[PDB]
């Protein structure tokens, strides 16, 4: 019993993180095979912060403008290379740490463990999700760039987020592995705002059959909704449209629990109606949308 | 910018994560040096359930009645021993991965990560602290029991707390490493309940002063309060009384942001009778009491491990 923001255990990520210096700009590497991985930003330079050509900067760099440090060992760079906004450092030492893994690039609603790094060394590990409007709402200070974001279901390590950037809202932004944003961000420190964000509907219903298949009930109601009336009160409270793909996905919760999606619905609608009214649920007094339908069965089943 | 439950790398503990199995039982071990240590109802059988003698079960059992599975590879056991509610398993190998590390036995009030496994095998982590009633809000399924909870300083791992059972209200018992039960608890079936609960006094203002270095300022106000004044405040509300000890530890985060601490605690004060008026503080509806003022100073400043 019991529900927590649960990460995944960080080992497999640990042995992974080094310290990339180019310049006066030390930040955190990825360090996989052969190859070190960090937000291209590191060969940027205070002067030249609003618009870097990134191709310009990095064909006058040789190999030797870039320190990589695995803890005390220091590691040659041999090459290097550009793909989107990541740099790619190759090393002639590969990593005997390295676990099995894969790059995937997620969907706003995601969920992922997230191992904030700074000088390459690891400092927690806390649970996160892709907000709508693509940013995530993370513990980072300066000198975290470069910190991933992963899951490990089933002994495979799947990287999904490098930070790079804090926008000015206080939220983060970064890429997958593969360098591409998510969002409309860009590794240049030009005006760029978050849009307005909402709420992730199908974790919030997510979250409530946890509540239920955890002994809360209090919630509940005897009315039901169709997906349509829904879906206008959602829009009303700054949440996400719930869709056909979301009731298919909240099945298998919905049968363990006996509670219809679109009854789980009309008690979301209550809640927002009426709010908390003194009490909790799960242990919080506000709805919670960064659990998913496959954290939860996760970490109840 | 932000501010998460954060829990410690768990690195260092995956390593020492072993299955051990007594019988049909099969639960969590944690494989130090030589030595494994575990829950000892691990030997208990459903009927030893009611009230069971461990000293007799123990000693009519064989050093190969353990089965420890480090992963795919079977670790040998080649002496036993009972200690308080731990089981400690001598085995024929070091294990290579073991940390520094110490036993430690942790305060209420007091926060730690938990890495909870099934078969040997970590499958979460996540914060939580030792309720002042001595129970620990944890999330447990079946076959965790042997799951244990850590601190880390430097490069030292803090081993404070060993999982064996839940509840009946469905929060968590367990004790330290050296079998000492946090509580008024017993590894046995029989009813057991738990003191009632209280709001950890000292973290919540920890807490605040997390959200007011994160720009959250709107439930500060220009008011100051006694160490009485609010003592019997925090009676009224179910709150942990607040020692000198407590505003001396908070000193720094009071340095930090230019709110002593009986200011905050005319701020919170102002939150308990009148509730928190619609709005949040660091993304939250509650008054969150499982920071400690160390916790807080770890994500602010970036202390790395
Ligand atoms: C990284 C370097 O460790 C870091 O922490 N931050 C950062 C600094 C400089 C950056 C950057 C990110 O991204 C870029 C792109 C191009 C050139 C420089 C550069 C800082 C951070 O994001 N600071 C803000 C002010 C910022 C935004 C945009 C920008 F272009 C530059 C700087 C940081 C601080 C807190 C949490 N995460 C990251
Ligand atoms: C363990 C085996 O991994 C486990 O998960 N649980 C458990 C099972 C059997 C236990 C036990 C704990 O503690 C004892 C003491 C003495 C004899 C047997 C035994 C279960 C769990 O705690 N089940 C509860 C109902 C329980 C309590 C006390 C008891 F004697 C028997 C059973 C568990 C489930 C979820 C989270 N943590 C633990
Ligand atoms: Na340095």
Same mark, same amino acid.
């Given at each position: 019993?019991?529900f927590?923001?649960?990460?995944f255990?960080?080992?497999k990520?640990?042995?992974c993180?080094?310290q ?17 991985y960090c937000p291209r930003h590191?060969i940027?330079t205070?002067?030249?912060?609003? *618009?870097? *050509? ?9 190999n030797?403008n ?5 803890? *005390?060992? =220091?590691?040659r760079?041999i090459?290097?290379?550009m793909? $989107? ?8 030492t590969? $990593? ?8 995937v690039?997620? =969907? ?6 997230? !191992? ?5 060394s ?8 892709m907000?709508? $409007? ?23 390590v ?9 926008l ?8 997958? !592995?593969?360098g ?5 961000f ?5 005006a760029q705002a ?5 709420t992730?509907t199908v &974790? ?12 809360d009930?209090?919630?509940? $109601?005897?009315?039901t909704?169709?997906? &349509? ?7 009303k409270?700054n ?20 509670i219809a ?6 008690? !979301?609608?209550?809640?927002?109606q009426?709010?908390? *009214? ?8 506000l !709805?919670?949308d ?12």
């Amino acid at each position: 019993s019991g529900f927590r923001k649960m990460a995944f255990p960080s080992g497999k990520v640990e042995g992974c993180m080094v310290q990339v210096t180019c310049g006066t700009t030390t930040l955190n590497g990825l360090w996989l095979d052969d190859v070190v991985y960090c937000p291209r930003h590191v060969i940027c330079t205070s002067e030249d912060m609003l *618009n870097p *050509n990134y191709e310009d900067l990095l064909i006058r760099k040789s190999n030797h403008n870039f320190l990589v440090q695995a803890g *005390n060992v =220091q590691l040659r760079v041999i090459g290097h290379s550009m793909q $989107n906004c990541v740099l790619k450092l190759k090393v002639d030492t590969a $990593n005997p740490k390295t676990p099995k893994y894969k790059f995937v690039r997620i =969907q706003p609603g995601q969920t992922f463990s997230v !191992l904030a790094c700074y000088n390459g060394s690891p400092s927690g590990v806390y649970q996160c999700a892709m907000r709508p $409007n693509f940013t995530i709402k993370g513990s980072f200070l300066n000198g975290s760039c470069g910190s991933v974001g992963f899951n490990i279901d089933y002994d495979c390590v799947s990287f999904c987020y490098m930070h790079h950037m804090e926008l000015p809202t206080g939220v983060h932004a970064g890429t997958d !592995l593969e360098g591409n944003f998510y969002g409309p961000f860009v590794d240049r420190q030009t005006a760029q705002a978050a849009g307005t964000d909402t709420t992730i509907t199908v &974790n919030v219903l997510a979250w409530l059959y946890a509540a239920v298949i955890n002994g809360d009930r209090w919630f509940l $109601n005897r009315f039901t909704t169709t997906l &349509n009336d829904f879906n206008l009160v959602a829009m009303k409270y700054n949440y996400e449209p719930l869709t056909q793909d979301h009731v298919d996905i909240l099945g298998p919760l919905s049968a363990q629990t006996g509670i219809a999606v679109l009854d789980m619905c009309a008690s !979301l609608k209550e809640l927002l109606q009426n709010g908390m *009214n003194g009490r909790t649920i799960l242990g919080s007094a506000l !709805l919670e949308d960064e659990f998913t339908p496959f954290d939860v069965v996760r970490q109840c089943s």
